[PDB]
């Protein structure tokens, strides 16, 4: 039994706990604005202030800053719950708070908001979880690489003893391309220098100089009122000076047309790469899913490679088994005493398993040492049953 009570018991690393402080991020579809995302961040702020007073001490919303990266698509609210005494129940506690909260955002909305216990742990090591990445080892571009990642995400979900796999955040939004005919430019009489620092200074911004304000030196920025650069028709408004002291429109030398690029190009180890955050199956656990993901990436096109308790214990414990026998013969010479004590090991450990297999615990870090401490008391108990009796 003892074995079966252990092999079947799942293995975590460290337990996620209510911290009196959690958070929840936002993410809008292809190229949403600051005004559209701010509408969502309000709805999130509210569930917390109205439908969770007895709980939420204070929020701290932030429009335009994800933990994927940043931009007008993203967001994040920083919560700060009311102390644990005034907040007694299991429903009051964070596991249940980020449950009906996540339920609400996947119900009365039209985008993506979640919520999570701040993984006390470190960032890494969720356990029964992953971090894959799809490198382009050959001359392929971002466009052909993308399609191979679609075929990876597809084949895993097409034949998942499953898996739950999704991309990280390359949405893939369009971009307003502006071709400048170079022959035409100089025929009308304009330097390409003057044209570029018109478009870059007007729509994007430009660090001109530094000025002084109330002691501290700050910066001077040049751009333009919002309403003359909100859409593609406003490009024509800008008239550049031409050599022959007279104005010239953009439309003259321009060429307006949209395109399909991506708004974030990740690169792993000197080469292009798009990362894939999947998890272990609801049945399987890591080492299975990991080596059952490498075989799917090996069935992808050419020029597309990849790169990503613990196995720890097996060895660590091995030396536990070797130093016992030494110390069980540094004061107890025979080959009789060094096999006595040897039995109290799973005498007690069967119950250690059983107490935590019965209740809601797992094989985490505290358990792994709650074992070895239980074995040190098993030594105790027995060793006296021997030392005295010999």
């Amino acid at each position: 039994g003892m074995a079966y009570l252990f092999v079947r018991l799942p293995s975590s690393f460290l337990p996620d706990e209510d911290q009196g402080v959690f958070m929840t991020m936002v993410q809008l579809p292809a190229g949403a604005t600051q005004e559209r995302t701010q509408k969502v961040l309000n709805e999130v702020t509210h569930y917390y202030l109205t439908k969770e007073k007895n709980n939420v001490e204070s929020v701290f919303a932030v429009n335009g800053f994800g933990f994927a990266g940043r931009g007008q698509n993203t967001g994040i609210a920083f919560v700060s719950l009311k102390d644990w005494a005034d907040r007694p129940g299991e429903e009051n506690k964070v596991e249940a708070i980020t449950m009906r909260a996540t339920r609400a955002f996947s119900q009365i909305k039209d985008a993506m908001v979640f919520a999570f216990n701040l993984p006390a742990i470190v960032e890494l090591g969720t356990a029964t979880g992953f971090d894959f990445e799809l490198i382009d080892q050959a001359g392929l571009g971002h466009e052909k690489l993308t399609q191979a990642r679609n075929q990876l995400l597809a084949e895993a979900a097409k034949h998942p003893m499953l898996t739950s796999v999704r991309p990280n955040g390359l949405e893939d939004t369009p971009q307003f391309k502006i071709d400048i005919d170079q022959e035409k430019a100089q025929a009308l009489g304009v330097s390409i220098n003057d044209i570029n620092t018109t478009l870059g200074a007007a729509w994007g911004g430009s660090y001109v100089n530094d000025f002084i304000d109330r002691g501290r030196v700050k910066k001077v920025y040049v751009m333009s009122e919002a309403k003359y650069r909100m859409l593609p028709d406003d490009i024509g408004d800008w008239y550049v000076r031409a050599a022959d002291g007279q104005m010239v429109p953009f439309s003259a030398f321009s060429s307006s047309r949209w395109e399909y690029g991506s708004p974030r190009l990740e690169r792993y180890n000197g080469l292009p790469s798009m990362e894939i955050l999947g998890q272990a199956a609801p049945g399987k656990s890591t080492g299975e899913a990991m080596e059952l993901m490498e075989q799917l990436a090996s069935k992808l096109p050419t020029g597309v490679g990849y790169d990503w308790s613990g196995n720890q214990a097996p060895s660590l414990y091995a030396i536990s088994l070797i130093v016992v026998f030494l110390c069980l013969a540094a004061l107890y010479e025979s080959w009789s005493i060094p096999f006595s004590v040897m039995l109290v090991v799973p005498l007690g450990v069967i119950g250690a398993l059983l107490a935590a297999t019965f209740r809601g615990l797992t094989n985490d870090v505290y358990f792994q040492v709650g074992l070895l401490t239980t074995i040190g008391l098993s030594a105790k108990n027995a060793i006296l049953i021997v030392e005295f009796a010999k």
């Binding site: 604005t33 502006i178 870059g200």
Partner: protein, 150 residues
């Protein structure tokens, strides 16, 4: 570890007392060892290529990784990485009336990427629906395209 730092940091006080040809070139501070060990040859047999094609692929897939990998002080390259090479003809420059300063300036204008802003700008008007990035000039790609510069 520290001994490198000290030389490579007080070096970068002299850095702007240095030709701009040399600044945009490779300044370097490394850990010396006049003594190779692994000198991995890389040849071709079937799909034949030259002593130039290989030096490029070596230095565009392998070399970048090696130097970084497992504390390699510095890597040596036995050839050169590829580069868009241009062989200016002087007689053909004369019969149109031109200099090598005009070819150089033509590449420092047409062959470049530029920072163009975005629709639905950082401070927009409340209630805009769209937000996408502008593209402008682009860094060139092939031989062909470097042949069609004005």
């Amino acid at each position: 570890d520290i001994a490198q730092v000290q030389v490579q940091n007080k070096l970068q006080l002299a850095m702007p007392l240095l030709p701009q040809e040399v600044q945009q070139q490779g300044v370097s501070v490394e850990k010396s060892s006049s003594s190779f060990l692994m000198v991995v040859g890389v040849i071709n047999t079937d799909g034949t290529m030259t002593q130039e094609d290989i030096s490029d692929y070596v230095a565009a897939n392998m070399k970048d990784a090696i130097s970084r990998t497992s504390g390699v002080g510095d890597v040596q390259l036995f050839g050169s990485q590829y580069a868009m090479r241009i062989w200016m003809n002087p007689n053909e420059l004369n019969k149109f009336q031109l200099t090598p300063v005009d070819v150089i300036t033509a590449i420092k204008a047409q062959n470049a990427q530029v920072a163009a802003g975005q629709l639905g700008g950082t401070p927009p008007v409340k209630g805009q629906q769209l937000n996408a990035s502008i593209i402008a000039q682009t860094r060139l790609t092939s031989t062909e395209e470097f042949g069609k510069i004005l």
